[PDB]
Amino acid sequence: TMKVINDPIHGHIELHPLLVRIIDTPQFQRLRYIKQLGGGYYVFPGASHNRFEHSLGVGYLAGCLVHALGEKQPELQISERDVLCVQIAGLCHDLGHGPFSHMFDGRFIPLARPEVKWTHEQGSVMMFEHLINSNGIKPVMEQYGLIPEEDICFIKEQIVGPLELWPYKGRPENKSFLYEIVSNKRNGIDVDKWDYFARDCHHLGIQNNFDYKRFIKFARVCEVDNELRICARDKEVGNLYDMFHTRNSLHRRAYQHKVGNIIDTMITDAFLKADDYIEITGAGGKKYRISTAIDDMEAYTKLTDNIFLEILYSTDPKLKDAREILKQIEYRNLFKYVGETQPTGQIKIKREDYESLPKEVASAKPKVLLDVKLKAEDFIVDVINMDYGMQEKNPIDHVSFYCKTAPNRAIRILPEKFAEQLIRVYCKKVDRKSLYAARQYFVQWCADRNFTKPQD
Amino acid sequence: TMKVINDPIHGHIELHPLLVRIIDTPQFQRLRYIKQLGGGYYVFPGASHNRFEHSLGVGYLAGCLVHALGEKQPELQISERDVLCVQIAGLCHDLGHGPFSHMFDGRFIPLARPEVKWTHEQGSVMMFEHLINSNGIKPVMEQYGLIPEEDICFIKEQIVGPLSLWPYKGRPENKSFLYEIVSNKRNGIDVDKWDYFARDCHHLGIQNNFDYKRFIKFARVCEVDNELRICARDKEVGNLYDMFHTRNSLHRRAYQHKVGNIIDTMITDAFLKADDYIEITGAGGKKYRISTAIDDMEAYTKLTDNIFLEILYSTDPKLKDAREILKQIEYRNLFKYVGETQPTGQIKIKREDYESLPKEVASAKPKVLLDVKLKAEDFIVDVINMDHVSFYCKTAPNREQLIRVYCKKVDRKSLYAARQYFVQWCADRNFTKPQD
Ligand SMILES: [Ca+2]
Ligand SMILES: [Ca+2]
Ligand SMILES: [Fe+3]
Ligand SMILES: [Fe+3]
């Protein structure tokens, strides 16, 4: 038969042999050493889960959804090849994640290389191609009825989106709903977001109220404005609300934790101080930095969380400055929270301007002059985005439902409005004179940047 | 005021500032990089938890039990300092675990240094002393009412044991029940096992039936043969049997997994071929081997699961042989399972003769000659090791080894060969006939 995996969130998981061949690969097993939340592990002891089990769950849920729609609506012409293609897309959607997951692409790369526009989804596509190329997956695809020329393009489009009128080339327009499963761009609701909602809740002691298996059993494909979309049963709006609340509770209590995000900036600070002295060997023996390893998948395969311990256990004097910061984490001698603000009604801060932010705070002009002159090297500016690629909107407005009487047409038509971006400032000095001075600079920068007034 | 932890098993737990000082320590944060189940992670994806979260739970449960006894029995004179000592003891009981937990002291060390005797508890006390000294914890202990002379001895004794008559020095026999909490050496029912019963079930998807909370609630200390022992209520024996079934289920389905133990042996083998070339920095620039890092505690502090990846990501030609085996874990090209047996007598194979076992199998002469001759290196033999609880009346509140053999050759001929060797080796060691 085929492999069975006992997941603590989904139960028994059945693995097609093609999936097994993709998993038993250094590019996929790489995800065993990538913390799902990263710095959150040092705040929540149960947050020890890695990207490996998350990807296994996303592929399982993607196959469950596509198989349910096929067996419930034969008119959709869903093939078993389409089921496996969606499963692979769910398995390999997080292949491009770097050390400590969103810390790498969200903060480190913008700080070390602000000129490059890099996302972990781009790396997922590059790592997928490197995976199939380095392990002879294409003949195994042909074994199981797949056509690599268009199916691999279909998988990549499911992971990253269109590759620059129907813009997708992997599947015709009459199967547009297949592009809404692994990563939905219309509303953000997808099986990928469902897996870590349950996984993170399971690992942090927060309660999950969204029954995702109930949602799959009532998911149907329907015609909405001449477009085939995956619709929900009307009697599932209460489950939908519970899903929204569960994501906000995770954001308010875990993702935006004030100490966990500090630790993320400290790990980023150590990585930045160590970027000039670590060497990762790529294809042809070429030495790559931590920041430049994203240009070479052969080197990026060797870039996991152990570079944290490589720096911590290093004896090189060149790495001492970076080693000291990591030692500070073990002693809980963390950076000091100065304050928090928010760009309500303002244009959100972009990744390419992260590097200029601490120099902008140190350049503030407080009225009350103090005997403590602070430099930009004493300030850390943290930008926390609940979704960097999103604009303020209610997702229910982009969710379509169906009735039991009209199971092919949608319906013409308490939720917590959520902040998107939070600006936190930390100081590296620990003395009360500098710590109070940094607070003065920060409140002055909040009026200049036209951000909300800091309270405390 | 004290720090609060959100734990998936126990919920919100409060940490005394002394405990926090011990936690904020590289000697203790080392536990963040030590898989609890080791090779079991490569079979169960949810088993990503480390020893750090488990130690926190044991330190919490031990304090809960002592506090519950003191509150429910003000005659025991259990002081807040007695509570802290038990909390620290459970918090530091596993400080001596090496890479991938029990495969380091249970297989690797006996294979690399068969002459040395080493256990993770005997290393946990060394870790505790090094932890206390390197961080100046004794003054912090005193400022919270802890006297270091008696207490350090107390904490060490309820971890490793006494170092005819009452052999403990940290507490008198009047507080003997305190030594039965973190690790019981009589029947084997401690809060340590309670924590990783629920925690492992929670991460493996295995159903946990024991409720440690309702047990602790109805737990009291009674007199058994003129001695004070922890006893349970007469109607809470259903919880006791659910504990025993959860243990049996965890061993049968998780701790004794086929592929899981094969991965452990494969990781041991790569460590053995990487032992002569990996350098661990120790006390004052000195260099130790992976097998010799246990002699220096500062070198052991830097011995974690990261060794697995320094071998994997290495480019040293001397490390090529070890790097090959770790890569075969990623490609799922594992050792083939040959057979399984157990000793017929009460005698049990110790660790000083683990490396002699594969050659014994290869030295066997099967009764029928065959084509493939097998070397000792082609065999892997790992050893898997595994009613007496007091109670009280509600009215009157008082009064073994398993042997598995694997083959590194994975072809039809060599596997038939290995089975013939294994059957013959079981025959002249008087072991149970292998099930076909
Ligand atoms: Ca992703
Ligand atoms: Ca133990
Ligand atoms: Fe994901
Ligand atoms: Fe333990």
Swiss-Prot record, chain A:
There is a cross-link at K348, K350, K373 (Glycyl lysine isopeptide (Lys-Gly) (interchain with G-Cter in SUMO2)). Changing N239A: Impaired homotetramerization and slightly reduced dNTPase activity. DGTP 2 binds at N6, V43, R214, R233, K235, N239, H257, K258, K404. It comes from Homo sapiens (Human). DCTP 2 binds at N6, V43, R214, R233, K235, R253, H257, K258, K404. DATP 2 binds at N6, V43, R214, R233, K235, N239, H257, K258, K404. This is Deoxynucleoside triphosphate triphosphohydrolase SAMHD1. It is linked to Aicardi-Goutieres syndrome 5: A form of Aicardi-Goutieres syndrome, a genetically heterogeneous disease characterized by cerebral atrophy, leukoencephalopathy, intracranial calcifications, chronic cerebrospinal fluid (CSF) lymphocytosis, increased CSF alpha-interferon, and negative serologic investigations for common prenatal infection. Clinical features as thrombocytopenia, hepatosplenomegaly and elevated hepatic transaminases along with intermittent fever may erroneously suggest an infective process. Chilblain lupus 2: A rare cutaneous form of lupus erythematosus. Affected individuals present with painful bluish-red papular or nodular lesions of the skin in acral locations precipitated by cold and wet exposure. Changing D211A: Impaired homotetramerization and slightly reduced dNTPase activity. Impaired homotetramerization and reduced dNTPase activity. In human, and in contrast to mouse protein, the SAM domain is not required for deoxynucleoside triphosphate (dNTPase) activity and ability to restrict infection by viruses. Changing R214E: Decreases dNTPase activity. Impairs homotetramerization and nearly abolishes dNTPase activity. Changing Q36A: Abolished dNTPase activity without affecting homotetramerization. Abolished dNTPase activity. DGTP 1 binds at Q36, L37, R51, K193, Y196, D200, R247, Y255, Q256. One of its GO terms (biological process) is innate immune response. Changing I88N: In AGS5 and CHBL2; loss of function in defense response to virus; decreased oligomerization; decreased ability to restrict LINE-1 retrotransposon activity. Changing Q421A: Loss of function in defense response to virus. Does not affect oligomerization. Retains dNTPase activity. The active site is at H120.
